[PDB]
C-alpha cells in the first residue's frame, strides 16, 4: 500500500543550562524505529523497533555521525535565527524539522517533504517540485538564499528520490510482519447515563494500526458532525492506537443512532448499535 | 568564494609560515588542506573541523603542519620550522554544506618557497622588443615580445597594458620560465611573452604599450646584509610607444 518514512528533528537552545539539545526520531509510517539525543552521556543512535536491531554496527555508527553533524549545525542555525529576529541570548528557542518520502501503492517516490519551524511556526519548506522553497518571512528568505547558494534542494531531491526510497523499502521488507500487517480495531459500545433524561453512548476502537480511522455517529442516516464528541487518536504504547466518539442521546432513543467504523485492516466499514 | 593569505611566501629555513583559509561569504564547519607539487595531483593533507582537532592523512606529520580552526570562517595552516623540501603549493577548500562533503570552493593557493640562503633571491630585468618591419609588410600584424630575466624564485606574473588598460587579446606568455644555467639548483629564470597587434595599431605613435612584470620577493621584516637593493615584492616594467614609417 501507501507507506512513508519521516525524520523529526528538534533543536532547543537553553541559555545558561548548557549547549543546545538536539533530538531526532525516525518513523516508518506510524512506527518509530530510531532515536538520538545529544543530551546523553554517550550520544549514539538507538533502536526503538525490533526489525532495526538486525542492522550492523556500521549503520548505528553512520547514523550517529549524521546526528552529530546536525547537533553542530543546529547550534549555529539557532544563533543565526536569534540574530535575524534580534532576540536576546537569554531566551530559549526551538528549531523543528520534519522531512521524508512517500511511496505510492505502485511503490515509487510519490512525494518528498522537508519542512522547518521556528518557535512552533512555519519557517521554510521545500516545495512539491523539490527545487524551490517557501519562506515564511524575510528572516527565512536569508536562510532561503543560503540554501539556494548551497544547492540544498538539489541535495534533498537526490536523497528523497534515492536513499530515502531505497532504505524505506528495506525497512518495509525487514519488518513486513508488523509494518505491512494492518491491525483491525476492536469495537464495542458502552452506556453511561449522565441524567434521568439524557445518557452518553461511547463508540470504542482499540488495538488498530495504522492510526488512520474514521468514526461517525449517524442519527437514522444523517451525520451528527456538530453534536459528536470525538477525541484525538491516542497511542496504546504497544505500536497500536485507540479512539472513541461519544454522543449524549435521550434515555430511550438509543436505537435511532448508528456508529460507522472505517479502517485499512477491516474488510468492510462496520456499523454498530448499543447492545444492552 | 574562499580565499587565502599570503598568496606567495619566501622565507629562510627554520621559520614558521602561517597560511589563512577564509570563507568570505559563508560559514564553514570544515576546511580541507591540500598540497600540490609539480606532479599534478591534489594531495589531501588534513581536514580542519570546528572546533575539534584536525584529522591528518596518512604520512602527514601532525607536528610539522599545525591546523587551527578558530571560527566558522577561518582555518590556519602553520608550516613549523620550514625546510626547502616543504616548498609547495598549499591550497584549501571549504563549502557551505556540513556532513557528507558537497560543493567545495578552493582558495587561490599559497606558493611557499623555503630557501637555505635568502641571498640567492634576485628581481627580474624587463625589456620590450619592438616588432620587425619584415613582419609588418609580410603579414600586416606586429608582434611585440617582452623578456624578464635574472629572477629567483619562480614567483612572477606578467601582464600587457595597452594605453593604461590591461589586454588579454593577442597575448600569450610561456607557461613556465626557463633556467639560465640548467645545471645548478639555484638557477635564475627567464620568461618571455608576446602581444600581437595590427601594423595599423603599431603605426600610431599615440599608442602606448607596457609590459608589466609583478615579482614576489622579500618582505620589510626580512633582513638584508648585502649592499645591493633588497629584492622585495615589486613591479618591474618595460614600455614602448607606437612607431610610424
Amino acid at each position: 500500500g501507501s507507506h512513508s518514512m519521516r525524520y523529526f528533528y528538534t533543536a532547543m537552545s537553553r541559555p545558561g543550562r548548557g549547549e543546545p539539545r538536539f533530538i531526532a526520531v525516525g518513523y516508518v509510517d506510524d512506527t518509530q524505529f530510531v532515536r538520538f539525543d545529544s543530551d546523553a552521556a554517550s550520544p549514539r543512535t538507538e533502536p526503538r523497533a525490533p526489525w532495526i536491531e538486525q542492522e550492523g554496527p556500521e549503520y548505528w555508527d553512520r547514523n550517529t555521525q549524521i546526528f552529530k553533524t546536525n547537533t553542530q549545525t543546529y547550534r549555529e542555525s539557532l544563533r543565526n535565527l536569534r540574530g535575524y529576529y534580534n532576540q536576546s541570548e537569554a531566551g530559549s528557542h526551538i528549531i523543528q524539522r520534519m522531512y521524508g518520502c512517500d511511496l505510492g501503492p505502485d511503490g515509487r517516490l510519490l512525494r518528498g517533504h522537508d519542512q522547518s519551524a521556528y518557535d512552533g511556526k512555519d519557517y521554510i519548506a521545500l516545495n512539491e517540485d523539490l527545487s524551490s522553497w517557501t519562506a515564511a518571512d524575510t528572516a527565512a528568505q536569508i536562510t532561503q538564499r543560503k540554501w539556494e547558494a548551497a544547492r540544498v534542494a538539489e541535495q534533498l531531491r537526490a536523497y528523497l528520490e534515492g536513499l530515502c526510497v531505497e532504505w524505506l523499502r528495506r525497512y518495509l521488507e525487514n519488518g513486513k510482519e508488523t509494518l505491512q500487517r494492518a491491525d483491525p480495531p476492536k469495537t464495542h459500545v458502552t452506556h453511561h447515563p449522565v441524567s434521568d433524561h439524557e445518557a452518553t453512548l461511547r463508540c470504542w476502537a482499540l488495538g488498530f494500526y495504522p492510526a488512520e480511522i474514521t468514526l461517525t455517529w449517524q442519527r437514522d442516516g444523517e451525520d451528527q458532525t456538530q453534536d459528536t464528541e470525538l477525541v484525538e487518536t491516542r497511542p496504546a504504547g504497544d505500536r497500536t492506537f485507540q479512539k472513541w466518539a461519544a454522543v449524549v442521546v435521550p434515555s430511550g432513543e438509543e436505537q435511532r443512532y448508528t456508529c460507522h467504523v472505517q479502517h485499512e485492516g477491516l474488510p468492510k466499514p462496520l456499523t454498530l448499535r448499543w447492545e444492552p | 568564494v574562499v580565499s587565502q593569505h599570503p598568496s606567495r611566501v619566501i622565507c629562510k629555513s627554520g621559520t614558521s609560515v602561517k597560511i589563512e583559509c577564509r570563507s568570505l561569504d559563508f560559514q564553514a564547519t570544515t576546511m580541507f588542506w591540500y598540497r600540490q607539487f609539480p606532479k599534478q595531483s591534489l594531495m589531501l593533507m588534513a581536514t580542519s573541523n570546528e572546533g575539534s582537532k584536525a584529522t591528518y592523512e596518512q604520512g602527514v606529520e601532525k607536528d610539522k603542519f599545525l591546523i587551527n580552526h578558530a571560527s566558522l570562517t577561518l582555518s590556519t595552516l602553520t608550516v613549523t620550522s620550514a625546510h626547502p623540501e616543504d616548498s609547495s603549493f598549499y591550497i584549501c577548500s571549504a563549502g557551505p554544506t556540513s556532513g557528507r562533503t558537497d560543493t567545495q570552493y578552493f582558495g587561490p593557493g599559497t606558493r611557499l618557497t623555503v630557501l637555505e640562503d635568502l641571498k640567492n633571491v634576485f628581481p627580474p630585468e624587463v625589456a620590450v622588443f619592438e616588432p620587425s618591419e619584415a613582419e609588418i609588410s609580410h603579414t600586416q600584424k606586429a608582434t611585440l615580445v617582452c623578456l624578464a630575466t635574472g629572477f629567483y624564485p619562480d614567483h612572477v606574473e606578467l601582464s600587457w597594458w595597452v594605453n593604461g588598460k590591461e589586454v588579454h587579446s593577442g597575448v600569450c606568455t610561456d607557461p613556465q620560465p626557463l633556467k639560465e644555467q640548467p645545471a645548478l639548483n639555484d638557477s635564475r629564470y627567464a620568461l618571455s611573452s608576446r602581444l600581437r597587434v595590427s601594423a595599423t595599431f603599431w603605426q600610431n605613435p599615440r599608442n602606448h604599450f607596457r609590459c608589466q612584470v609583478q615579482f614576489y620577493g622579500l618582505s620589510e621584516n626580512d633582513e638584508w646584509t648585502q649592499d645591493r637593493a633588497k629584492p622585495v615584492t615589486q613591479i618591474v616594467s618595460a614600455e614602448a610607444w607606437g612607431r610610424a614609417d
Binding site: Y7, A24, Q65, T73, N80, K146, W147, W167 | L72, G99
Partner: peptide, 9 residues
C-alpha cells in the same frame, strides 16, 4: 537512514 548533508540556516 537520515539525510547526511546539513547546511546552517
Amino acid at each position: 537512514l537520515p539525510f547526511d548533508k546539513s547546511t546552517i540556516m
